[PDB]
Amino acid sequence: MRRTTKETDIIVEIGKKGEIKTNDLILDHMLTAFAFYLGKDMRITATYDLRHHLWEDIGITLGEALRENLPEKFTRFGNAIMPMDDALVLVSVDISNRPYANVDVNIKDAEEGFAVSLLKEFVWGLARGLRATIHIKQLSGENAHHIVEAAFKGLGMALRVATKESERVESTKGVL
Amino acid sequence: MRRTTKETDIIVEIGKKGEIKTNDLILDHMLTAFAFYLGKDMRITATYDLRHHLWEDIGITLGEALRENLPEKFTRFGNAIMPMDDALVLVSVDISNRPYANVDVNIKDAEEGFAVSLLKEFVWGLARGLRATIHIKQLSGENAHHIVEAAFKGLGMALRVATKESERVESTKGVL
Amino acid sequence: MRRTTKETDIIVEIGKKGEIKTNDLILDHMLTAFAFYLGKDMRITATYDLRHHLWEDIGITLGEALRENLPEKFTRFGNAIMPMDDALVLVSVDISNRPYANVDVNIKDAEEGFAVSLLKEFVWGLARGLRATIHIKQLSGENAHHIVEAAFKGLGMALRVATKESERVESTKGVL
Amino acid sequence: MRRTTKETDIIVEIGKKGEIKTNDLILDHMLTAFAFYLGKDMRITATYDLRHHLWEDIGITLGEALRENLPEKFTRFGNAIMPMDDALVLVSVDISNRPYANVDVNIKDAEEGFAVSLLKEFVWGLARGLRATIHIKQLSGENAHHIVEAAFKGLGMALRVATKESERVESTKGVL
Amino acid sequence: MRRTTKETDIIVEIGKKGEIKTNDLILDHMLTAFAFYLGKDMRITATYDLRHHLWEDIGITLGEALRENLPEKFTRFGNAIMPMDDALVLVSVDISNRPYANVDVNIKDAEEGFAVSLLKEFVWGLARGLRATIHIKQLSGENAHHIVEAAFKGLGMALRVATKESERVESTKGVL
Amino acid sequence: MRRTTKETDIIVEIGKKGEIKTNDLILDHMLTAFAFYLGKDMRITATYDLRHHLWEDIGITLGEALRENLPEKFTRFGNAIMPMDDALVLVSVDISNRPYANVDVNIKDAEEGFAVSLLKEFVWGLARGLRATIHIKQLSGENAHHIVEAAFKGLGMALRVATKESERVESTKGVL
Ligand SMILES: O=P(O)(O)C[C@H](O)Cn1cncn1
Ligand SMILES: O=P(O)(O)C[C@H](O)Cn1cncn1
Ligand SMILES: O=P(O)(O)C[C@H](O)Cn1cncn1
Ligand SMILES: O=P(O)(O)C[C@H](O)Cn1cncn1
Ligand SMILES: O=P(O)(O)C[C@H](O)Cn1cncn1
Ligand SMILES: O=P(O)(O)C[C@H](O)Cn1cncn1
Ligand SMILES: [Mn+2]
Ligand SMILES: [Mn+2]
Ligand SMILES: [Mn+2]
Ligand SMILES: [Mn+2]
Ligand SMILES: [Mn+2]
Ligand SMILES: [Mn+2]
Ligand SMILES: [Mn+2]
Ligand SMILES: [Mn+2]
Ligand SMILES: [Mn+2]
Ligand SMILES: [Mn+2]
Ligand SMILES: [Mn+2]
Ligand SMILES: [Mn+2]
């Protein structure tokens, strides 16, 4: 899937053997973690003007790509609790068709390239593109890289669960 | 436009002279204010199980109806500052394709039938159905009815502006 | 229009080329600002015993004069945000037939002749004579003259909007 | 199973396709969520005098019905973390034969029909009827309906796990 | 118009279709937003030593170019309230011939390339080159890019209003 | 496997049906819980001088024995949330080859034989022998025995998950 604006040009191809090359080494690493714990190969390429636009538009495109790949009847709910050294991060997803993100982190030891702004904009992008409810809740930790990487690992693991096929439409209201 | 779940059954028809009859007298009043200040006739009918499901699903259906009704090129931005006796409420809308709501109110004198829960759920529904950014920011006020009605009046006025036809795609990124 | 008591004798004639001469140089200046931003010539003359009675009775007479000049179907709502150097003042008017004034200012650097008492009594007079809801909300500023003059400039601009002719009775209740 | 007092008359039949009709529309909705996420059809009918007696006695009767339905050797432990928009609620169950409930919620935006009293009394009833340890721990959230519905969804999911057949008596002390 | 010092060399040509290329990608994006919402084509090119000198001198030069472009009699006042996701920013301009800037923002989630220092210096440069009073007041928000971009969008929209032709000298003192 | 120092002499044999007999009745009970929820038979015998050296060295030896027992490719991650009456304890494990323990508990009602010192030293021993990251985070609770026992139950359950065979090396860096 390709999404192109005047700001960014992004390809996300889920289930395809390929490199993740966004021209942002931090995001390449985070997306590698996400794909690995999701349990899917993917090819991702991007060009961009500003890193915010990249992280957001990657979130949106990835979310749309996951939505396109979603079985007609899907599990809907998935969670992960991801430790990474000092970090302990809860990730909870509901593929609800109600875009919402709540990212609650507390970075004590900052690291160049890792920013809460960028994390939040990726997650809101993902929530909007997938049309999902996403909570990221830090339970412990100080290190920026461990916290953010735990969040991406957790997103991958939670979405592994939530995107599996189900026998039914997973809502009491009869529609998702 | 009709939206039907096991919880609610809603029809919203913009531009048709008709009744607003939701079987919730508070919501009927608030929607009447909204339609009046938007400057458009509309017919709205609904059945529901619980009031929260009604307020939310009315927001969603109304938002989708407004989105369907938009000119290809639209003004995108609209604001209103709405006084109502003690209440003074700022409503700011960006038809951004990025669902978001922030409803920041402070009700001192409560009134039966008016609930922040219901206002928030309508606004989030509208933000999700229209695919828009919506801020409701109370500047002054105490009375629940004045605050909530000012918000609905302000939403009508802000959307009156934001849904008008434009000569261009109103985004520097070239797409909405 | 003339209003005469044992305390004051006031003439306000809107749409007439003339001087504003109240025998209070501060009020003459504030009224000049008001008329200029309203976009109307006016003639105003007054005699008075005490400045409070002047500012109040000018408010009342001006409000009655605006009410007499109001089209049968009028726009009802008008706002202004007026910067003046350090001052930034929001003025929001609803010609509601529900007299109410809320003047929320915070003068740090006082100036002879400018008093919150006098401002409040003018505004309450205006609200009572016009039969309107009036909010003045200081958003920024320290200087008494800039804050009060911004309020009068803003009143003029807000009433310019609110006193324009409309195609309809601007109330969902069918009466104003 | 039928439980009858001078206050309430309740039938709960697990595994029968049937209606959930308690004459309380909120509880009907919450029980529908519970049964849906438990993954079991059930028929529930009730009459009652006061809502508290209904919520409590429904908990008791449902708990007894679940206890009667358990395989001799059961999994005992089950958890769910349930997001619902702003709400994020942890539900942790141990079918311990030691009745206990701790419901730790924080409702900011109240909603008519939803009460912490009623939630607590249902959960304590369920803990006493099933003979179980039940924690409901709010991690995030403001909305009453989202919080309470997340708790019922989470209870269904947690009990789905805890009520599954096991190869052994799940206790180091050799008895449950 | 061209402005050259030992620090910077800047060309701003309002009304010419052309590139905005300052050798600062963040400023290019912000000026693109500014020009788009002002509603005028412009060509802007720059070289510079240090980003602060660029942002400031661009503000000065753009301000001078706008001043040169004004009709003899101009509207003087303009406002915008600009939402951008979480951000909600008020921009209020008075082309007063009294240089003044007050930039009141609160960035919670910082982003590389975006700095309050640079925003303030651009706005002070603009106020000084145009000879204007400029308030930027954040009402809501956390994200640096959303806040700063909302300010530039808002400046564009406010100056669109303020730079229009008027029938009169817009001052009670008879000169601007 | 056997580990002998001048302080302790410990045998841990995973997969062998046998006694857990450490000459510390509290540790015997905790290890019984651990083994039961891990789902593996084991024989553990020990002699010791001081209880701290026992708890630590048991942790080390058990960790080494688990490490020796791992398949070449293992699941790596495992979590448990364990209620025990008032206690609710999160246990999160990553068999990371990066020894780390964070035991975050809050015992209100102390009990003879149970000490935070001993729990921490067991967990650090285990993290160091297995070469793993281990978080024990109390979410609720007062009673020492319930809290500590929930931690051991949870460690068993979490390691049941983490020690299973995987089809791949579970790390984006390609080595563990
Ligand atoms: O989570 P869902 O949509 O499956 C069912 C809910 O009952 C719908 N809802 C949304 N807000 C309150 N209720
Ligand atoms: O508001 P838009 O989408 O027209 C242009 C913005 O540049 C896009 N954006 C979204 N977050 C940061 N920038
Ligand atoms: O503002 P109005 O009078 O047009 C209509 C309102 O519904 C009347 N009202 C006055 N208080 C509460 N409602
Ligand atoms: O949780 P159980 O009943 O399987 C075993 C526990 O050892 C019993 N216990 C209850 N309080 C303290 N210990
Ligand atoms: O805003 P202006 O210059 O049009 C007229 C003001 O009265 C001048 N002024 C400046 N400070 C106080 N008053
Ligand atoms: O958790 P791992 O070792 O599988 C991969 C991580 O990227 C390595 N890392 C360790 N600290 C920061 N990153
Ligand atoms: Mn963004
Ligand atoms: Mn890493
Ligand atoms: Mn809802
Ligand atoms: Mn009303
Ligand atoms: Mn008085
Ligand atoms: Mn003056
Ligand atoms: Mn009771
Ligand atoms: Mn519901
Ligand atoms: Mn400078
Ligand atoms: Mn941008
Ligand atoms: Mn030690
Ligand atoms: Mn015990």
Residue numbers in the entry:
A (entry chain C), B (entry chain A), C (entry chain C), D (entry chain A), E (entry chain B), F (entry chain B): 1 to 176
Give the text the authors published on this PDB structure.
Significantly, the mirror‐image packing of the two enantiomers of C348 in IGPD2 gives rise to equipotency and, as in d/l‐AOPP superinhibitors of phenylalanine ammonia‐lyase, the mimicry of a reaction intermediate gives rise to potent inhibition. This study adds to the ever‐growing body of evidence that certain enzymes are chirally promiscuous and that mirror‐image packing of ligands is a more common feature than is generally recognized in the field of drug development.
The program of herbicide development described herein aims to identify inhibitors of imidazoleglycerolphosphate‐dehydratase (IGPD; EC 4.2.1.19), an enzyme of histidine biosynthesis in plants and microorganisms. This enzyme catalyzes the manganese(II)‐dependent dehydration of (2R,3S)‐2,3‐dihydroxy‐3‐(1H‐imidazol‐5‐yl)propyl dihydrogen phosphate (2R,3S‐IGP) to 3‐(1H‐Imidazol‐4‐yl)‐2‐oxopropyl dihydrogen phosphate (IAP).4 IGPD shows strict enantioselectivity for its substrate, with the other three diastereoisomers of IGP acting as competitive inhibitors of the enzyme, thus indicating that the active site shows some flexibility to accommodate inverted chiral centers. Previous studies have shown that IGPD is inhibited by triazolylphosphonates, whose potency is based on mimicking key reaction intermediates. In this paper we describe work on the lead compound, 2‐hydroxy‐3‐(1,2,4‐triazol‐1‐yl) propylphosphonate (C348) and present a series of structures of IGPD, from Arabidopsis thaliana, complexed with a synthetic racemate of C348 and with the enantiopure compounds.
